[PDB]
C-alpha cells in the first residue's frame, strides 16, 4: 500500500517518513 495523504490533499509517497514529513505541514508544526 502507498503512503497517501488524505487531508482533500492526497499526495502519494513511497516512503512513510516522507509522508510523515509531509503531514508535518498539516499538523505537528505551526
Residues that bind Zn ion (CB under 5 A): 5, 7, 9
* Cβ proximity to Zn ion, 9 vs 18, nearer residue: 9
In what helix (H) or strand (E) does residue 12 lie, and over which residues does it extend?
strand 12-13
Residue 14 CB, nearest distance to Zn ion (Å)?
15
SS3 content of the chain, % helix, strand, coil (to 5): 25, 15, 60
Residue 5 CB, nearest distance to Zn ion (Å)?
3
Residue 7 CB, nearest distance to Zn ion (Å)?
4
Amino acid at each position: 500500500r502507498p503512503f497517501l495523504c488524505t487531508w482533500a490533499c492526497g499526495k502519494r509517497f513511497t516512503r512513510s517518513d516522507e509522508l510523515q514529513r509531509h503531514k508535518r505541514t498539516h499538523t505537528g508544526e505551526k
